[PDB]
Amino acid sequence: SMFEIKKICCIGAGYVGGPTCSVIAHMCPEIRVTVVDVNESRINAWNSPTLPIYEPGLKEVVESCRGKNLFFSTNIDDAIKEADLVFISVNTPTKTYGMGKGRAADLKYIEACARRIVQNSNGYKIVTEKSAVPVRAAESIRRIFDANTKPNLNLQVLSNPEFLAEGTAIKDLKNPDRVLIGGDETPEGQRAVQALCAVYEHWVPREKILTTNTWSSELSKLAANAFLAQRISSINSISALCEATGADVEEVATAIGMDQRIGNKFLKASVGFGGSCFQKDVLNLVYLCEALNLPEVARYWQQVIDMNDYQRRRFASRIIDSLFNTVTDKKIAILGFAFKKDTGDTRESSSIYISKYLMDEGAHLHIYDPKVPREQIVVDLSHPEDDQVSRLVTISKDPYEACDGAHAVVICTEWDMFKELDYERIHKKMLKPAFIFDGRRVLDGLHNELQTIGFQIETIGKKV
Amino acid sequence: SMFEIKKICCIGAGYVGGPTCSVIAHMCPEIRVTVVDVNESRINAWNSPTLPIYEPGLKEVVESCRGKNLFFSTNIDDAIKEADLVFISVNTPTKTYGMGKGRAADLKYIEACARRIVQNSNGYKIVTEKSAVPVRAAESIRRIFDANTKPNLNLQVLSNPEFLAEGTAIKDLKNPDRVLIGGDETPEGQRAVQALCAVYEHWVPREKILTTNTWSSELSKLAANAFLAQRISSINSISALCEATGADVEEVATAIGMDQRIGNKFLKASVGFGGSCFQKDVLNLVYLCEALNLPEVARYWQQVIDMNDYQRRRFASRIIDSLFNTVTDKKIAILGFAFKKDTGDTRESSSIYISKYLMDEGAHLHIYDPKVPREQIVVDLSHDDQVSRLVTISKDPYEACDGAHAVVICTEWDMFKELDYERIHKKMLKPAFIFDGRRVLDGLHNELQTIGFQIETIGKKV
Amino acid sequence: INSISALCEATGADVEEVATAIGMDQRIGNKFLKASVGFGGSCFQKDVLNLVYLCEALNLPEVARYWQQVIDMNDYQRRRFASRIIDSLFNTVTDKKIAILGFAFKKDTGDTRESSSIYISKYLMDEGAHLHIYDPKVPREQIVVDLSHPGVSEDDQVSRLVTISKDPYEACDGAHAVVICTEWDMFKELDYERIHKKMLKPAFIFDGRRVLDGLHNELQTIGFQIETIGKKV
Predict the structure, then answer these.
(1) Is C35 annotated as a binding residue?
(2) What is the total count of domains within chain B?
(3) Inter-chain contact B108–C91, Cβ cutoff 8 Å?
(4) Rounded CA gap, B337 and B355, in Å?
């Protein structure tokens, strides 16, 4: 309102900072947006005709304003000096050792940015956390600024979390459900908050811009992903009950989802949710609870993970039991390795875990995924040159090789192609009894024809 | 359309059967709908100008078709003989003893109906469970029919659960989010399912009528109330974290609820959910899981109740710590006793539980609620000497607050934001606390701090 | 052998076939291998509990717990038998008439001490069952004592819920279930066709002693659901 952002700097040219800043430039022609990164190779790519990130619509957005008001540079320090607003958009990996190993977020990159910003800054700037951060991250940035102050240096700290999913990043940026901005409840804080609102007001309606305090903002990002993951674990818990009673989890999911207060999204049973966001955010929320002496809340959210873990384990057990509790040297087809369809991302994929369970039985796994690189599958199934993987794991170039001589076909990722395969042919060449374990309900409605063909076909959330 | 339902009999003239059948008759002029009950007094009332159930819109519906195609009668046996479709719409109270005491559903009334139906039936009929039943209830009706069969007796069993809330029953029947009908995956089951679909098709669009197997149908009713309860416990869990960090739970709930995949309903933090459906249904789910050797699933759903109970307990503890952990002969005002605003219903009301905690500290409660009858409050807080010594029921809020150390809002009635707080302050003992258990005073905070209250609320840091 | 009966019910093996096979090994012997709803009498539980207590007194918790299993198993065998009954009646037995045939701890005596009939009857009382109890030797006064809350000369629950029958046909007349808890030889000679006519349907016979073995097809033809210990349903 009073203050006007005219220059933005984004430290971090990854999957958050690049696209967000590209859309900001596209929508705000009068604002100069400079995306910076230490990685010279990456910056060069952003300035090339082959962008380092593939996202539908991104190329068009970047090419429409790069060189006009959108810039990519390795000159971090100059970008900061010039900036009115600086986004910090670096990753916060999970700690791999020490207090909170495996669960707590590691602020090392956030801290390095804060130190660098204060070292290169004079006068008034707004500094905004854009990466997924743990609650209190802004407190730390503020401590660093307060401890390294200079005359006439006035840095304001805001939180502005990202709500982007892979594959929908541009749509999500152009037409967001909401934009969330957190700042202090002081006149300074509210000045800063309003300045960044005005940026988003160039293309987002005021009623979709939610302003909060900084802790509410940070906590909403974590909490939102926990609520989404909870719906999957809840419908997965129902799937177990369906298998025991004769109910069908897709019928039940549809019935529950038609109540508009619950809604019909995120109610699809599966072998288990995956990706780099759901488990990580829930565990981060559980760690935070324990750290604040809220064990009841900690144990309440831990259930979302325990349930996902159980869902995977019981699926593996149905497989193994159906093979008479011996799978040593039995060939099994694993169709699908990505954590979900239409990606090559294997981070926390249920396919990894199902696979490790069968490896632990001596299975000879032939794994097919149309999009995941074969080197990645080998890494994911290896211990942190791995003999168990080279002894037990074959990566198949087509799905027929993977089923050929197999005892079971296990569908772990919901790629659409898997429902189109020649199952008559696959049946001829399998050992008998021939099983199909559908971990994604993707073969619904082929059931009768598959049983006619001769398969024992089994799925999640359906009684055998 | 092979088979056409032309006569419907509903056994049970209560809150479910009466209104549902009244709406069916209203919407299906060619169908004769006869609601029966053993309780002659109640039937008479359904035939009177003062219906035994108050529901907005119900009188108009009933008066528009009673005596034309809608009938209420104590002649249960004739209605069954005539009927093409018989609804069983009786209560299934929770067992009060024995295996599953306090959690399992008691099928005695459902069984009695089934046995009576088979005794009075010949030929083809469709029998449909309309009451909230445990999973496998239809199996039991089936077993009874199969065990007491007669030549040419062909009874088909369907599930058709109710999704009505008090106060919105007519709206919910005229314009339902969905109609759910479960039946066997056999030609005869599908024929039966289609006949009942056709009844609903007189006024509900086909895309809103969901057909399933019988177990899916029974399980969906229980699961829906459980998912809804989970949202409240989930946002309540966040409210604890807000109090510890400085986040505000209403800011967080808005942020979360604007994601269209989550939605913005049922995300209002409180001292705790209540009512006769949520805890009951979740507990029945937990019991069914244990029975079926699904302990992981059981413990997943118990968290919904354990969280609600913790929310109530930590709220009471805040109140108690604020008066130094000694409330004995302290006067405290409880404003609101209903489980939610705009009802007299106290079933599983968080006000009961808050109040019982303070009573266990020796607090003198003065309780006001604008619609709950006094005798209901006395019963709810009894096992009674602890009540008569410690509980006073006030005819107005100002009495209850007069000379109180604290004012505790437990039910979100709109009138509580309109009270003369300057007045209440003049007459309270100092420090004068208001504990808002419902976020109903949000936005009066600054001025209430100005007046001199130490105002505290759920999901906000002190 | 009771623990094996549970496994028989789960798999399709028959506990009497298994008992006979095990017992023909002369090192094991064929005595005391008869599956039941549970052992009773004034000796077994008391002596085993005494032994367990001695172990704990002597800091031998491993031996204590080894022997405690003989009791725990017996309690489980009782509880799961009652649960079969109750589950078969839809988990509600309030005001249902159920015949209890046999109250003595074993046949051919009036001794009821620690009889499994007392425990199965107490489980069905906790469901509100209306129990009609018949035994050819046990005095009626002793049954009333055995089911009463001790130190209560007139129990409200016993007089509301329990009827002592002077004949088995009275006990089964209008019953949902006939529960045989003691192995009296007379029970295999009963006129079951007659019993079936006047029972409510579905009509269950729960044989807690294997005393109706070989009658099963005949009882299924008459139209009973006949269930017993150590046979799959």
Answers:
(1) yes
(2) 3
(3) no
(4) 9
